[PDB]
Design a protein around this ligand. Structure first.
Ligand SMILES: O=P(O)(O)OC[C@H]1O[C@](O)(COP(=O)(O)O)[C@@H](O)[C@@H]1O
Ligand SMILES: [Ca+2]
Ligand SMILES: [Ca+2]
Ligand SMILES: [Cl-]
Ligand SMILES: [Mg+2]
Ligand SMILES: [Mg+2]
Length: 321
């Protein structure tokens, strides 16, 4: 402990994944998510930590379970901060599609950036390009710098990015630069980790995705010794000026209340403040990062990726009876 808890945390994501898996292909993203949230909370509440949910399902008002500030754990052990994404890929789960997974990160008290559930522009790279990125520079400059750091031509650089209307221009810009663009339907947490996975052609993740998702990515990227910058963006500034403005202003007032500057570049250490992070993710369906659950009779299998910032990276293939 806390290294002794690594296995306990993997059981939490295995439970969440198996619970979400029950709703795979059932066309109900809310119910799938609720099942995974419930299973994750049940399991966390049997772990010997004094956990606070810092990234989660919503404020107490909108989220009955795993709400921001919720206390979880038996209360024995260390005060830790907890980031949960019980299903990354809820729509993908509802639709029986690839790349759904259950995600948890655990760190020292105060180790995760406290920021609103708003959008964040992200630029994420692996260890081979650590120190070569700066979101204050033009995208094309960053991409050139990263390719040079990795010792490959620009035309071979592979950038992953969410396939969303907000990204039309930048995707076209990158393709014109001659880079390879892997535009993904959802799931920038899992995709961010591919930057640190040698057998994935992905070199960089770039683009606007969920802020809490970006803070989880910062935690795991830090643990893997990659690099990331983020920049918080208000809703109307990413979707267009229309109730976006209303949502946007709540977000900016929240940034101030939490003492965060929106639109300012966040360095890796601004989002994940220490190396003492345990990250666990378990596949629901097969994706680029993890195998999916299988079931034959009364036996089910899961694969879990378990990463500890202090230290080896583990892939745990379990058979459950
Ligand atoms: O769908 P949006 O509004 O582009 O939000 C992007 C965020 O949603 C995700 O793609 C997850 O999708 P789901 O919410 O369906 O689970 C994240 O990986 C990402 O950060
Ligand atoms: Ca959720
Ligand atoms: Ca999410
Ligand atoms: Cl969009
Ligand atoms: Mg969405
Ligand atoms: Mg890779």
């Amino acid at each position: 402990m806390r290294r002794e808890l690594a296995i306990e945390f993997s059981r939490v994501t295995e439970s969440a994944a198996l619970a979400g898996y029950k709703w795979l292909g059932r066309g109900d993203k809310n119910t799938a998510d609720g099942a995974a949230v419930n299973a994750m909370r049940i399991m966390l509440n049997q772990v010997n930590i004094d956990g606070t949910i810092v990234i989660g399902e919503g404020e107490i008002a909108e989220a009955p379970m795993l709400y921001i500030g919720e206390k979880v754990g038996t209360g024995r052990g260390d005060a830790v901060d907890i980031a949960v994404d019980p299903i990354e890929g809820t729509r993908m789960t509802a639709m029986g599609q690839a790349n759904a997974l259950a995600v948890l990160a655990v760190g020292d008290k105060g180790c995760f950036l406290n920021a609103p559930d708003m959008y964040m522009e992200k630029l994420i790279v692996g260890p081979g390009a650590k120190g070569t990125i700066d979101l204050n520079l033009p995208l094309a400059d960053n991409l050139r710098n990263v390719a040079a750091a990795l010792g490959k031509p620009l035309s071979e650089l592979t950038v992953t990015i969410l396939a969303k209307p907000r990204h039309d221009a930048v995707i076209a810009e990158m393709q014109q630069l001659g880079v390879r663009v892997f535009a993904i339907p959802d799931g920038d947490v899992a995709a961010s980790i591919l930057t640190c996975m040698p057998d994935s052609e992905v070199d960089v993740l770039y683009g606007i995705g969920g802020a809490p998702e970006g803070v989880v990515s910062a935690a795991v990227i830090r643990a893997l010794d990659g690099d990331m910058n983020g920049r918080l963006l208000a809703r109307h500034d990413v979707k267009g000026d229309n109730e976006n403005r209303r949502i946007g202003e709540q977000e900016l007032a929240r940034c101030k209340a939490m003492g965060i500057e929106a639109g300012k570049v966040l360095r890796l250490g601004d989002m994940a403040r220490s190396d003492n992070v345990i990250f666990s993710a378990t596949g629901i369906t097969k994706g680029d990062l993890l195998e999916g659950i299988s079931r034959k009779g009364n036996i089910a299998t899961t694969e879990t990726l378990l990463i500890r910032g202090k230290s080896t990276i583990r892939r745990i293939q379990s058979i459950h009876y």
